[PDB]
Enzyme design. Structure first.
Site, PDB file in Angstrom:
ATOM      1  N   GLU A  35       9.303  39.784  -3.133  1.00 24.01           N
ATOM      2  CA  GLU A  35       9.127  38.438  -3.944  1.00 24.01           C
ATOM      3  C   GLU A  35      10.314  38.034  -5.178  1.00 24.01           C
ATOM      4  O   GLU A  35      10.865  37.272  -5.235  1.00 24.01           O
ATOM      5  CB  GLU A  35       7.667  38.035  -4.412  1.00 24.01           C
ATOM      6  CG  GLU A  35       6.576  37.900  -3.109  1.00 24.01           C
ATOM      7  CD  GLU A  35       6.869  36.969  -2.317  1.00 24.01           C
ATOM      8  OE1 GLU A  35       7.819  35.992  -2.807  1.00 24.01           O
ATOM      9  OE2 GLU A  35       6.096  36.448  -1.820  1.00 24.01           O
ATOM     10  N   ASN A  46      11.230  25.898  -3.674  1.00 26.14           N
ATOM     11  CA  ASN A  46      10.896  25.686  -2.291  1.00 26.14           C
ATOM     12  C   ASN A  46      11.121  24.422  -1.583  1.00 26.14           C
ATOM     13  O   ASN A  46      11.658  23.480  -2.370  1.00 26.14           O
ATOM     14  CB  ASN A  46       9.077  26.096  -2.223  1.00 26.14           C
ATOM     15  CG  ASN A  46       8.744  26.887  -2.857  1.00 26.14           C
ATOM     16  OD1 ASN A  46       7.894  27.073  -3.770  1.00 26.14           O
ATOM     17  ND2 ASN A  46       9.068  28.097  -2.731  1.00 26.14           N
ATOM     18  N   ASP A  48       9.812  22.039  -0.325  1.00 28.52           N
ATOM     19  CA  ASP A  48       8.745  20.881  -0.779  1.00 28.52           C
ATOM     20  C   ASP A  48       8.880  20.576  -2.427  1.00 28.52           C
ATOM     21  O   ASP A  48       8.201  19.384  -2.451  1.00 28.52           O
ATOM     22  CB  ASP A  48       7.250  21.511  -0.637  1.00 28.52           C
ATOM     23  CG  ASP A  48       6.800  22.380  -1.518  1.00 28.52           C
ATOM     24  OD1 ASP A  48       7.518  22.887  -2.324  1.00 28.52           O
ATOM     25  OD2 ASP A  48       5.635  22.518  -1.586  1.00 28.52           O
ATOM     26  N   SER A  50       8.495  22.138  -4.897  1.00 31.17           N
ATOM     27  CA  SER A  50       7.747  22.951  -5.870  1.00 31.17           C
ATOM     28  C   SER A  50       8.553  24.182  -6.213  1.00 31.17           C
ATOM     29  O   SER A  50       9.619  24.594  -5.587  1.00 31.17           O
ATOM     30  CB  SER A  50       6.494  23.598  -5.201  1.00 31.17           C
ATOM     31  OG  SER A  50       6.583  24.458  -4.116  1.00 31.17           O
ATOM     32  N   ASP A  52       8.647  28.729  -7.381  1.00 31.11           N
ATOM     33  CA  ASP A  52       7.937  30.039  -7.225  1.00 31.11           C
ATOM     34  C   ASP A  52       8.407  30.687  -8.627  1.00 31.11           C
ATOM     35  O   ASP A  52       9.663  30.735  -8.757  1.00 31.11           O
ATOM     36  CB  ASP A  52       8.150  30.799  -6.132  1.00 31.11           C
ATOM     37  CG  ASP A  52       7.526  30.403  -4.710  1.00 31.11           C
ATOM     38  OD1 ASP A  52       6.752  29.435  -4.917  1.00 31.11           O
ATOM     39  OD2 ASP A  52       7.838  31.061  -3.637  1.00 31.11           O
ATOM     40  N   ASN A  59       3.273  29.791  -7.148  1.00 32.69           N
ATOM     41  CA  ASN A  59       3.989  28.597  -6.681  1.00 32.69           C
ATOM     42  C   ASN A  59       3.204  27.574  -7.670  1.00 32.69           C
ATOM     43  O   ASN A  59       2.066  27.388  -7.958  1.00 32.69           O
ATOM     44  CB  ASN A  59       3.695  28.288  -5.231  1.00 32.69           C
ATOM     45  CG  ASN A  59       4.475  27.090  -4.629  1.00 32.69           C
ATOM     46  OD1 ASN A  59       5.018  26.282  -5.308  1.00 32.69           O
ATOM     47  ND2 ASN A  59       4.528  27.126  -3.183  1.00 32.69           N
ATOM     48  N   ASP A 101      -8.417  33.460  -2.750  1.00 25.33           N
ATOM     49  CA  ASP A 101      -8.611  32.014  -2.273  1.00 25.33           C
ATOM     50  C   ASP A 101      -9.131  31.834  -0.910  1.00 25.33           C
ATOM     51  O   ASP A 101      -9.300  30.785  -0.545  1.00 25.33           O
ATOM     52  CB  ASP A 101      -7.293  31.294  -2.403  1.00 25.33           C
ATOM     53  CG  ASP A 101      -7.488  29.545  -2.581  1.00 25.33           C
ATOM     54  OD1 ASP A 101      -8.373  29.282  -3.396  1.00 25.33           O
ATOM     55  OD2 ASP A 101      -6.878  29.083  -1.820  1.00 25.33           O
TER      56      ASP A 101
END
Ligand code: NA
Length: 129
Positions: A35, A46, A48, A50, A52, A59, A101
């Site tokens: 990562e 990202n 979209d 967003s 990280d 995110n 989650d």
């Protein structure tokens, strides 16, 4: 901060991540490697829109607030900038919520693509833990 491998393993273990939700320390260190390359200051945009943040590339779409992710949640109730600190407490606290989650460490695509099923204990090899 760029952590050493065994330095990050110790810090993660100290913060209760070793075998958290059944994930051995080697899994977490492997995720951090691919990562962030163990860089607390790592940020990546990202598709979209967003972002990280930090050692575990958490995110802004769900977990932290960066003020620039329209329609996003802040489920860890932290500024994303808190996830870039040399002290990994906030990244770890927030990662415990992510991995809880429902999809375990699959939430980290790099973990699924690069760590899952591999010899993850190699990541803690030679470490004094
Ligand atoms: Na957000």
């Amino acid at each position: 901060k760029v952590f050493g491998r065994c330095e990050l393993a110790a810090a993660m273990k100290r913060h209760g991540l070793d075998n958290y939700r059944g994930y051995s320390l080697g899994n977490w260190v492997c995720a951090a490697k691919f990562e962030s390359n163990f860089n607390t200051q790592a940020t990546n945009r990202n598709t979209d829109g967003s972002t990280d943040y930090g050692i575990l590339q958490i995110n802004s779409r769900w977990w932290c607030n960066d003020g620039r992710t329209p329609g996003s949640r802040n489920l860890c109730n932290i500024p994303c900038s808190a996830l870039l600190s040399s002290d990994i407490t906030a990244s770890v606290n927030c990662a415990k919520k992510i991995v809880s989650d429902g999809n375990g460490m699959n939430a980290w695509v790099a973990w699924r693509n690069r760590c899952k099923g591999t010899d993850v204990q190699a990541w803690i090899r030679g470490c004094r833990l």
